[PDB]
Amino acid sequence: SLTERHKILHRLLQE
Amino acid sequence: SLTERHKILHRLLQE
Amino acid sequence: QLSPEQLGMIEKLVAAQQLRVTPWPSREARQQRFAHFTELAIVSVQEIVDFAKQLPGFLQLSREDQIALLKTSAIEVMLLETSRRYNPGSESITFLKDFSYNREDFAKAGLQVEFINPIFEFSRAMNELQLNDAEFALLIAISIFSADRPNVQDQLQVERLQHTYVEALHAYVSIHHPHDRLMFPRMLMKLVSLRTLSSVHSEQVFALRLQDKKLPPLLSEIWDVH
Amino acid sequence: QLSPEQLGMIEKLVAAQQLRVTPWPSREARQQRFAHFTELAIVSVQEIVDFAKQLPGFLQLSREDQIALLKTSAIEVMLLETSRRYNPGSESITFLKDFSYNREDFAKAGLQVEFINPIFEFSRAMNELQLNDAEFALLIAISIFSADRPNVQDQLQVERLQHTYVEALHAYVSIHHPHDRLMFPRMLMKLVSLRTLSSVHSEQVFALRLQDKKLPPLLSEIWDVH
Numbered sequence: 001s002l003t004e005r006h007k008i009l010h011r012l013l014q015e
Numbered sequence: 016s017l018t019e020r021h022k023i024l025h026r027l028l029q030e
Numbered sequence: 031q032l033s034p035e036q037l038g039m040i041e042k043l044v045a046a047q048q049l050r051v052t053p054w055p056s057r058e059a060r061q062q063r064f065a066h067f068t069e070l071a072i073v074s075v076q077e078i079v080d081f082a083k084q085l086p087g088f089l090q091l092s093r094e095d096q097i098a099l100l101k102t103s104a105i106e107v108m109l110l111e112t113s114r115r116y117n118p119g120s121e122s123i124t125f126l127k128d129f130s131y132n133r134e135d136f137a138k139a140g141l142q143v144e145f146i147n148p149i150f151e152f153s154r155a156m157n158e159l160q161l162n163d164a165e166f167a168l169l170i171a172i173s174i175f176s177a178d179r180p181n182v183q184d185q186l187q188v189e190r191l192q193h194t195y196v197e198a199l200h201a202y203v204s205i206h207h208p209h210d211r212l213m214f215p216r217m218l219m220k221l222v223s224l225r226t227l228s229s230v231h232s233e234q235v236f237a238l239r240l241q242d243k244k245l246p247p248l249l250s251e252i253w254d255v256h
Numbered sequence: 257q258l259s260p261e262q263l264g265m266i267e268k269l270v271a272a273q274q275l276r277v278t279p280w281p282s283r284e285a286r287q288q289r290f291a292h293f294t295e296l297a298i299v300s301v302q303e304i305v306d307f308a309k310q311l312p313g314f315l316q317l318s319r320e321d322q323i324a325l326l327k328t329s330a331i332e333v334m335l336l337e338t339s340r341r342y343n344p345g346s347e348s349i350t351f352l353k354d355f356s357y358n359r360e361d362f363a364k365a366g367l368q369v370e371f372i373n374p375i376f377e378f379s380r381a382m383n384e385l386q387l388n389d390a391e392f393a394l395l396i397a398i399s400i401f402s403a404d405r406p407n408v409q410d411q412l413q414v415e416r417l418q419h420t421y422v423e424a425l426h427a428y429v430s431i432h433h434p435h436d437r438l439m440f441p442r443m444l445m446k447l448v449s450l451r452t453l454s455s456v457h458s459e460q461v462f463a464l465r466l467q468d469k470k471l472p473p474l475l476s477e478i479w480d481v482h
């Protein structure tokens with residue numbers, strides 16, 4: 001996935 | 016110029 | 031409202047738009063398929079040059095600006111002409127009313143999948159809009175008159191000419207789609223996608239350099255890095 | 257005509273858009289100037305993510321589509337924020353209400369002229385349009401919601417959302433510029449120039465790999481080829 005390859009962007013979206 | 020480097024395109028425009 | 035002057039200009043563009051090509055078939059078959067596609071591309075450039083010369087304001091620009099505009103817009107105009115020839119049923123493109131090709135045929139002609147998929151995806155997207163001759167002629171004129179192209183001198187005049195085509199498209203589209211105000215910006219937004227395709231195309235030209243596949247003189251002139 | 261729903265939406269977008277940075281100063285000064293620019297870019301990515309989360313329809317897309325949209329629109333949105341901060345007099349850009357930088361400062365920060373020139377050329381052209389907070393917020397929303405981005409799954413929904421912002425921009429611009437029908441397509445046409453700028457930035461990212469200049473984790477994630 002793109003999600004597993006974009007951990008920082010993923011974390012910024014989750015917060 | 017682009018003209019000196021585009022001789023074929025230049026001739027198509029002139030004709 | 032569409033003026034008599036915009037009406038006449040559009041109709042003339044539509045009228046303005048209305049041969050030994052290597053036939054479609056081993057290194058011999060591979061070379062022949064590639065030559066078929068480069069030769070169709072050469073025919074397409076020649077038609078774009080002929081149509082560009084009929085555009086109000088084009089021949090008043092310096093020959094240098096005429097070259098700057100055609101050099102960079104050629105691929106976008108070629109991809110719009112390709113999208114116009116798309117068959118949604120068979121997912122193929124018909125060139126010169128007889129030469130029908132799908133994604134596998136494009137690959138057999140030497141194109142990489144990173145270029146083929148976006149051509150076909152753009153073509154599918156364009157087909158959904160269902161543009162007519164008038165709308166295709168106007169989008170082609172807007173694509174040619176882009177002031178932001180590299181090496182353009184008279185940016186102000188190129189932008190002034192672009193706006194005349196944008197205004198005529200807006201007024202034209204308001205008659206063709208009177209109950210859908212989104213049809214006009216949707217067509218303009220296709221010019222955004224065309225810029226990405228032009229970049230994917232430049233990557234394809236670079237890939238041909240690496241595999242020593244040489245473009246014929248006219249295509250190498252407008253596309254290769256010297 | 258602007259509806260109460262579009263009015264309320266635009267106002268919320270404008271309100272949503274309303275620090276330990278390496279100081280700006282040899283091999284070390286070049287390294288610190290480069291670090292300063294990478295840190296300003298990180299702050300910009302963080303603000304883009306915060307803004308996108310406030311866009312109606314964005315958080316209803318899958319997280320995968322959210323990442324696909326943000327990964328490739330980030331640079332376009334950053335360059336729009338850059339154009340919004342352009343100073344026509346000094347031909348410079350003011351970052352974080354203090355840090356003013358010109359074409360030579362960008363070169364000193366490790367940027368190649370092939371990228372610096374198009375950024376300043378785009379910023380100058382954008383400044384002529386004199387866009388306000390609402391028009392920048394809507395152009396940013398339109399840039400984020402592009403169904404043609406690589407790896408977008410729900411292309412139809414991304415496109416339906418983009419059309420709501422396009423319609424809101426049209427209706428808004430008709431009040432802001434009641435006598436100039438060209439202002440709305442002129443703003444949309446700037447998205448065409450942003451695609452090229454994005455392509456030029458990719459070449460810049462590839463150049464940094466060659467000169468072994470490493471980007472910080474968040475920028476490497478969204479921009480590097482892994």
Ligand SMILES: CC(C)[C@@](O)(C(=O)N1CCC(C2CCN(c3ccc(C(=O)N(C)C)c(Cl)c3)CC2)CC1)C(F)(F)F
Nearest residue numbers: 067068070071073074077108111112125126140141234
């Ligand atoms: C030519 C080809 C080997 C290639 O060099 C290339 O650059 N291509 C981009 C342009 C593309 C063309 C194919 C021909 N096409 C048209 C489009 C329309 C017509 C037509 O029917 N007309 C009446 C003009 C014709 Cl004859 C040709 C425009 C896109 C072919 C792949 C490669 F992709 F790099 F491989």
Ligand SMILES: CC(C)[C@@](O)(C(=O)N1CCC(C2CCN(c3ccc(C(=O)N(C)C)c(Cl)c3)CC2)CC1)C(F)(F)F
Nearest residue numbers: 293294296297299300303334337338351352366367460
């Ligand atoms: C990060 C940078 C070293 C670089 O990687 C790059 O890709 N650039 C493209 C993005 C650009 C940024 C510069 C900072 N900029 C902004 C734009 C706006 C603000 C701002 O004032 N905000 C309130 C967000 C801030 Cl803090 C920063 C966004 C474009 C810097 C050059 C490189 F130039 F290629 F090296």
